[PDB]
Amino acid sequence: PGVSVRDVAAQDFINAYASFLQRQGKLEVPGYVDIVKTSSGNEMPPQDAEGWFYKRAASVARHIYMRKQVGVGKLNKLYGGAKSRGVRPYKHIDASGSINRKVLQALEKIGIVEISPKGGRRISENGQRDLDRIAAQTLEEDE
Amino acid sequence: IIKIRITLTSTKVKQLENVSSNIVKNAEQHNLVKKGPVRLPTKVLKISTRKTPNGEGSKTWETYEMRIHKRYIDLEAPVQIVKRITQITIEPGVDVEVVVA
Amino acid sequence: QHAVILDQEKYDRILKEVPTYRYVSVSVLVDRLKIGGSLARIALRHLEKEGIIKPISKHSKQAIYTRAT
Amino acid sequence: ALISKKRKLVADGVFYAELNEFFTRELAEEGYSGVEVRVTPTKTEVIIRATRTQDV
Amino acid sequence: GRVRTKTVKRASKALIERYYPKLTLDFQTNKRLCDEIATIQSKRLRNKIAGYTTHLMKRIQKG
Amino acid sequence: TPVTLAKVIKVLGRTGSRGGVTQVRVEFLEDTSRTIVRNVKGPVRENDILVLMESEREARRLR
Amino acid sequence: AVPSVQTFGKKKSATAVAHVKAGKGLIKVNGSPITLVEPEILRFKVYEPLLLVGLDKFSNIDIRVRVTGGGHVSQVYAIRQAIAKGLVAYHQKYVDEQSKNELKKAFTSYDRTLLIADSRRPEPKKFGGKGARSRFQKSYR
Amino acid sequence: FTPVVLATPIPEEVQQAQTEIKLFNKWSFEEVEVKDASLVDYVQVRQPIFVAHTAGRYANKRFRKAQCPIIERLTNSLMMNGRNNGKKLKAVRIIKHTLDIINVLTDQNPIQVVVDAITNTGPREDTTRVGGGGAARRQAVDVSPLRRVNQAIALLTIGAREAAFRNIKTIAETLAEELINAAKGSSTSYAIKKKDELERVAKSNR
Amino acid sequence: SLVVQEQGSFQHILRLLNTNVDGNIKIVYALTTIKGVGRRYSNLVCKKADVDLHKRAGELTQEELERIVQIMQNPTHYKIPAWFLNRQNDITDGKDYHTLANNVESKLRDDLERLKKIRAHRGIRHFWGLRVRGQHTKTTGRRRA
Amino acid sequence: IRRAAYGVVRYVMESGAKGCEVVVSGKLRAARAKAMKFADGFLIHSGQPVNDFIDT
RNA sequence: UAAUUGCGAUAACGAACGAGACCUUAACCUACUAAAUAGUGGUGCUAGCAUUUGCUGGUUAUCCACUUCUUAGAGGGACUAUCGGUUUCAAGCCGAUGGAAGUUUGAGGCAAUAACAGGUCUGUGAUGCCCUUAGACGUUCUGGGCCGCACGCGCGCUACACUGACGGAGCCAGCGAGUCUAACCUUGGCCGAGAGGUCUUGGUAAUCUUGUGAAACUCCGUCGUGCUGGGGAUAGAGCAUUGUAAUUAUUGCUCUUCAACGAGGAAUUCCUAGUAAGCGCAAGUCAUCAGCUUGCGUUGAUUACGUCCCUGCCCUUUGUACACACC
């Protein structure tokens, strides 16, 4: 019938593409995956310390396919939460931009996204047909 | 005939729409496509301050809005019409600006 | 004052006494039998997987298991 | 120049304020009252309003 | 409360004094008639005056 | 204890010292000849149904 | 050709711009279907006109609704009364007063104000207090 | 029924189960009964809703508060103890869980369990500190029906929070146990305990 | 699921680094009873030892325990980056040192007496027993005990 | 004070305003300040009429 | 009656101020004016799926029209309309329908006569009088100080956890501000674990920052009731930025340290509906620094629609040996 990723739910499609890049096994993940907190709003590293990065790549894939183009300040201000910054009240917090940039390098070297005119990095043809096939998988798994 | 844009600002609404009425009058007169003039949302400069000298309890405050009105008109005219509607259509209290491209 | 590892004895006690109940959650499991909650959730995943009880209303904060029959 | 319209209109209000206190101290012996400002390109004007312009 | 004041009530009093062969039992007629016949400075006060005039004529038709 | 049903006849008015206890006359829902004054705690409308632990107190104005 | 209407739905500070055209029964919100709207509870609260009046009322019409402003709760309220009053204005313009009154009496015998945007807007913060009514603690000594 | 198919993929559990009979998400507000006829027309169980998260307008006159579908007032008193002011989506989630648990522990209609608990649990007298002059005399007083259902809702939720507070037995579980042991006159649920206490001090001070 | 019913491989409270450790809780929070390691450091050292964290601390025996303690007290030999440590540049030596159970408070006293025989302002306010960071004293920390 | 402000009020009243008042505050005759408030005609103090119908 | 607001009655009659009215701002408008400095519809061009005719998108303007939403000039709209009741048969209230709204529609601006020995001589080249005026009571500079610490008090933030913390993952606002003789806001590209630093753009602003992709929230889970992974002060070590200078940690980041507190007495503070209460943002401050205030949204209640018992306030009567007036 023709399926997009707006046709499929959030958390399901994200988990599906996370396990998709796990099954493909090529991501150029960093060698320090167990170290970075991904944000100073955090207080512990991502405690699913094996598929968090696959899942974050799935998140940025979904979030770019719903949107026009992004760089890194969008991603940091998005995924960063609110830090328990002490006896001082909370605020809004920038995240780890370096993991974000390494994600974007990964998605370009795969062929997910490209750096784009009018700035930013937009989703390309291989990434779009990829996400369409995988959203089709997630909506065809329903027996 | 030059793709010009007049832009007007003030803080007096009566006089502002008066200037706009006069410019729309001359634009209706000289029959240009004119892009019928545009209201912009006001810039409302608030300076909220203490109501006191010296510092003193019951710590009130007053507010002092000023409001700023901005408008623009988008025209196509030869140079004589341009300088005509520029320099015969002036009135105190309203700032005028012309941009050519 | 609870337990934190299996023994195969309380395992069989689960196997017998959870089908006696018709309402199952981690907190009522660790209030009746002696478990520290997390292992009760492991047990709820096992008793969902091998069908002994019935999830009706699963939520990440709260799962509601019941009698299969 | 190249000043945003917020700062420009605040500057014009300040300008009127400063002229008003200036003439208020200067021409107080004269019978001064106020200032109207005629902002025009090509030689703008200031309308001093007093009672004794024969001595102004 | 909805107690109107004398800068409404005397106005409507004199208005039914000097325009009885107009001013029926319809508010909208009365409001348009007030906007033509009267010298008013504000919409909200005019609405008040006409409402009270309407109420007065409504009491007049019963006695 | 044979609990007493009742039905509101009419309120009288909130009395008591702080004001927060109304007095209502109620009919016993089975004896239409017998209505009775009764102190009530919360908010009481008309014609609704009261419950009583006794029927023969009929307490008075409170100050 | 191509019958159409755009209507709105607002609540406290949310705007959904509803649009009903003739169609096939494709309902959506921002391209996503309305069965993906995730406050996770108010799925049925935004199905509420459809589960109320029936789905054969969606014979040959498709929907698009767009959201900006107004949180999560109030923006799905914008979605629901957008789609409600949009179907209402559709039954005003392209079919008759009979079926328009049937639907309007359905929504007002289930008057959850799907036919009036709810007109309680915030109050401004004032001095003395971190809110509109309240004040600070005063000490007195 | 022949449920309809269309260009939209909406499940038959959404439509055919709940079109033409608009129960609830499940477990109807239809075929419901109030036990005592003093909660008639103070407890609006006359009309079924779907979710208790309706933007209520009901405090804005005096007595329109009685016409909230009483799941709404239960989940509206569920938001207390300060840090849970204004967390209504979590409160309706807790209500859905505790009604499912009521359904498990008793095959009866959960809304019937709740409303019969309200009947069984509303305190029917009150004691009130009256001064007169002097040293704080007390007086018994009858109670309004609407004040009774007010007090009862507050009691059920209060007992639920204070029991499940430091305890691992979750809030839906403790609320459901409060509902069961409030429906029956158990005298093991807090609200039944406090109803006994207030009626007892009224019986003393009358 | 993941249920394991072994009786003898598990045992209760054990001892590491001159300190007894309750084995009835998981590892990365269990090691934090050692005064000197934290949640973050225990997390990273168990990740560098490659031990599954769905198990508690009573099991996962002696060879993996030596793996734990060696990777803990040799960070540069087990490629923990330097900034992660708890005594970074360490004036007297220059080399880095992740300090641990007793040495944290021993070197704490050592640095205190280091700059207090120097007679700097901080060591002076330490020996006077008052608040050291440049904060107000005149209201808080009263009845300091 | 009294003669001077009487002359002022008389002048503006005959000059055609509908209302005028002149407050002279401060130290008159003794070492304690006492105000004098000179008003003729009627004056309004309340809302937006004060702004667009009064100079001060 | 919100009211010296009115209906009335009357040795008073006409009035002025005050309330009101007026003004802002919030809401409603298929109604005019129009909007490449905002949207929308269609057309191209194009990505991808489905392929069936459909859908998801991009596409500064490829290009044509329109104003529903944003906007704001002009207005309209409410008067308590309609109806029942109630009342000397008035002013009014009470209920129901209608609608955008019926507490004065909300919320403010304004708010009198007379007063205070209330605050300010330290905002003022506003001023008097006393005082000093060249080794100054003027400036100006280098440090210190206001930041000291047995202790008493005021305001607040974080909390005492499972309605919770943590970790993923979803991801939704409004008010604003922002640089010409300056380095303002920063998108973006790179590097850094982070703070940040770089290469450079945009923007004098409805454009660029910005839909400020805010927090709370909510889903999938780790933890199990243990002062424990709550709470995060204390305290050491390092790393940066701002500044001529950072110790009396400026402040930010990374690790380690884990204290008191188990919802807190007598007392007592605030609140009647988008309200309290929770939740963050922007601004004033600013070379940096907000735990503060000024304002904005987000989520949004329970309970009374009362009374004069207490804290008091207005009017009349009565009483006084008070008039600085019950201190």
Swiss-Prot record, chain C:
Gene Ontology molecular functions? structural constituent of ribosome
Which cellular compartments is it found in? Cytoplasm
At the top level, the lineage of the source is Eukaryota
Instruction: List, in alphabetical order, the GO biological process terms annotated in this UniProt record.
Output: cytoplasmic translation
Question: What cellular component GO annotations does this protein have?
Answer: cytosol; cytosolic small ribosomal subunit
Keyword line: Cytoplasm, Methylation, Ribonucleoprotein, Ribosomal protein
Which family, according to the similarity comment?
A: Belongs to the eukaryotic ribosomal protein eS25 family.
What's in the misc comment field?
It is presumed that the precursor part of S25 is engaged in assembling of the small subunit, thus being essential in ribosome maturation.
* Role description: Component of the ribosome, a large ribonucleoprotein complex responsible for the synthesis of proteins in the cell. The small ribosomal subunit (SSU) binds messenger RNAs (mRNAs) and translates the encoded message by selecting cognate aminoacyl-transfer RNA (tRNA) molecules. The large subunit (LSU) contains the ribosomal catalytic site termed the peptidyl transferase center (PTC), which catalyzes the formation of peptide bonds, thereby polymerizing the amino acids delivered by tRNAs into a polypeptide chain.
State whether it acts alone or in a complex, and with which partners, per the record: Component of the small ribosomal subunit (SSU). Mature yeast ribosomes consist of a small (40S) and a large (60S) subunit. The 40S small subunit contains 1 molecule of ribosomal RNA (18S rRNA) and 33 different proteins (encoded by 57 genes). The large 60S subunit contains 3 rRNA molecules (25S, 5.8S and 5S rRNA) and 46 different proteins (encoded by 81 genes).
Swiss-Prot record, chain E:
Additional information: Present with 30500 molecules/cell in log phase SD medium.
Q: Which organism is it from?
A: Saccharomyces cerevisiae (strain ATCC 204508 / S288c) (Baker's yeast)
User: Could you describe the subunit structure of this protein?
Assistant: Component of the small ribosomal subunit (SSU). Mature yeast ribosomes consist of a small (40S) and a large (60S) subunit. The 40S small subunit contains 1 molecule of ribosomal RNA (18S rRNA) and 33 different proteins (encoded by 57 genes). The large 60S subunit contains 3 rRNA molecules (25S, 5.8S and 5S rRNA) and 46 different proteins (encoded by 81 genes).
- Localization terms from the record: Cytoplasm
Question: Could you say which protein family the record assigns here?
Answer: Belongs to the eukaryotic ribosomal protein eS17 family.
Q: Could you list the residue ranges that cross the membrane?
A: none
Write the protein's name.
Small ribosomal subunit protein eS17B
**GO terms for MF:** structural constituent of ribosome
Q: What does this protein do?
A: Component of the ribosome, a large ribonucleoprotein complex responsible for the synthesis of proteins in the cell. The small ribosomal subunit (SSU) binds messenger RNAs (mRNAs) and translates the encoded message by selecting cognate aminoacyl-transfer RNA (tRNA) molecules. The large subunit (LSU) contains the ribosomal catalytic site termed the peptidyl transferase center (PTC), which catalyzes the formation of peptide bonds, thereby polymerizing the amino acids delivered by tRNAs into a polypeptide chain.
Q: What is the lineage of its organism?
A: Eukaryota, Fungi, Dikarya, Ascomycota, Saccharomycotina
Domain of life the protein comes from = Eukaryota
**Gene Ontology CC entries for this record:** cytosol; cytosolic small ribosomal subunit
Swiss-Prot record, chain G:
Subcellular localization(s) per the UniProt record:
Cytoplasm
Cross-linked residues for Glycyl lysine isopeptide (Lys-Gly) (interchain with G-Cter in ubiquitin) are 28, 45, 57
Q: Which UniProt keywords apply?
A: Acetylation, Cytoplasm, Isopeptide bond, Phosphoprotein, Ribonucleoprotein, Ribosomal protein, Ubl conjugation
What is any Pfam family matched here?
Ribosomal_S9
Q: Which GO terms describe its molecular function?
A: RNA binding; structural constituent of ribosome
Assigned GO CC terms: 90S preribosome; cytosol; cytosolic small ribosomal subunit
Tell me, what is an example of a GO biological process annotation in this record? translational initiation
Q: What is its main location?
A: cytoplasm
In-chain residues carrying the UniProt-annotated modification Phosphoserine: 32, 59, 74
State the residue spans of region: Disordered: 121-141
Residues that the record marks as modified (Phosphothreonine) are 68
Bias (Basic residues) ranges: 132-141
Can you tell which superkingdom this protein's organism belongs to?
Eukaryota
Could you confirm whether the keyword Phosphoprotein appears in this record?
Answer: yes
Q: Does the keyword Acetylation apply?
A: yes
User: What InterPro entries is this protein classified in?
Assistant: Ribosomal_Su5_D2-typ_SF, Ribosomal_uS9, Ribosomal_uS9_CS, Ribsml_uS5_D2-typ_fold_subgr
Further comment found in the protein's record: Present with 33800 molecules/cell in log phase SD medium.
Its function, per the record, reads: Component of the ribosome, a large ribonucleoprotein complex responsible for the synthesis of proteins in the cell. The small ribosomal subunit (SSU) binds messenger RNAs (mRNAs) and translates the encoded message by selecting cognate aminoacyl-transfer RNA (tRNA) molecules. The large subunit (LSU) contains the ribosomal catalytic site termed the peptidyl transferase center (PTC), which catalyzes the formation of peptide bonds, thereby polymerizing the amino acids delivered by tRNAs into a polypeptide chain.
Question: What family, per the record?
Answer: Belongs to the universal ribosomal protein uS9 family.
Q: By what name is this protein known?
A: Small ribosomal subunit protein uS9A
Origin organism lineage: Eukaryota, Fungi, Dikarya, Ascomycota, Saccharomycotina
What gene name does this entry carry? RPS16A
From Swiss-Prot, chain H:
GO biological process annotation, one example:
ribosomal subunit export from nucleus
Post-translational modification note: N-terminally acetylated by acetyltransferase NatA.
* Family matches, as Pfam families: Ribosomal_S7
Main site of residence? cytoplasm
Record has Cell wall biogenesis/degradation as a keyword: no
Gene Ontology molecular function: any one? rRNA binding
Q: What does this protein do?
A: Component of the ribosome, a large ribonucleoprotein complex responsible for the synthesis of proteins in the cell. The small ribosomal subunit (SSU) binds messenger RNAs (mRNAs) and translates the encoded message by selecting cognate aminoacyl-transfer RNA (tRNA) molecules. The large subunit (LSU) contains the ribosomal catalytic site termed the peptidyl transferase center (PTC), which catalyzes the formation of peptide bonds, thereby polymerizing the amino acids delivered by tRNAs into a polypeptide chain.
Which protein, by its recorded name, is this? Small ribosomal subunit protein uS7
**What quaternary arrangement does the UniProt entry report?**
Component of the small ribosomal subunit (SSU). Mature yeast ribosomes consist of a small (40S) and a large (60S) subunit. The 40S small subunit contains 1 molecule of ribosomal RNA (18S rRNA) and 33 different proteins (encoded by 57 genes). The large 60S subunit contains 3 rRNA molecules (25S, 5.8S and 5S rRNA) and 46 different proteins (encoded by 81 genes).
**Record-linked PROSITE patterns:** RIBOSOMAL_S7 (PS00052)
Q: Which InterPro entries match?
A: Ribosomal_uS7 (IPR000235), Ribosomal_uS7_CS (IPR020606), Ribosomal_uS7_dom (IPR023798), Ribosomal_uS7_dom_sf (IPR036823), Ribosomal_uS7_euk/arc (IPR005716)
The record ties this protein, via NCBIfam families, to: PRK04027.1, uS7_euk_arch
Q: Which gene encodes it?
A: RPS5
Report if keyword Acetylation is assigned.
Answer: yes
Q: List residues of cross-link (Glycyl lysine isopeptide (Lys-Gly) (interchain with G-Cter in ubiquitin)).
A: 26, 184
User: Phosphothreonine (modified residue): where?
Assistant: 8
